[PDB]
Design a protein around this nucleic acid. Structure first.
Length: 55
DNA sequence: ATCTACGCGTAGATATATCTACGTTTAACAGTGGCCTTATTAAATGACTTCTCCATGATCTAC
């Protein structure tokens, strides 16, 4: 996640400095929950980034 | 793994939103005619207390 999805999701940060963090900084584990499979904004951007990465 | 901070789920309190709809009979009448019983009978029979129980004085008779 922080290797590839984070730089495309987190727009303005140092990617190497992003490589040494916790998943919640970009996923938002305060919410998290199986609700990521729903229609939430982070789900939207994650799906967009995944679809762009693998075309 | 543990301490600490913070964002979120949630429950309680509150203001809001709910399209059709309207017009819902106006008129004139609410029987005009004639009758509202004609006959006849207005009981026919017999019965209308039944009975005692009397009041008073002269006379007979027993003690």
């Amino acid at each position: 996640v922080m290797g590839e999805i984070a730089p495309l999701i987190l727009k303005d940060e140092d990617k190497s400095e992003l490589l040494s963090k916790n998943l919640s900084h970009l996923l938002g584990n305060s919410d998290a929950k199986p609700a990521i499979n729903g229609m939430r904004e982070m789900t939207e951007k994650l799906v967009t980034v995944l679809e762009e990465l693998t075309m």
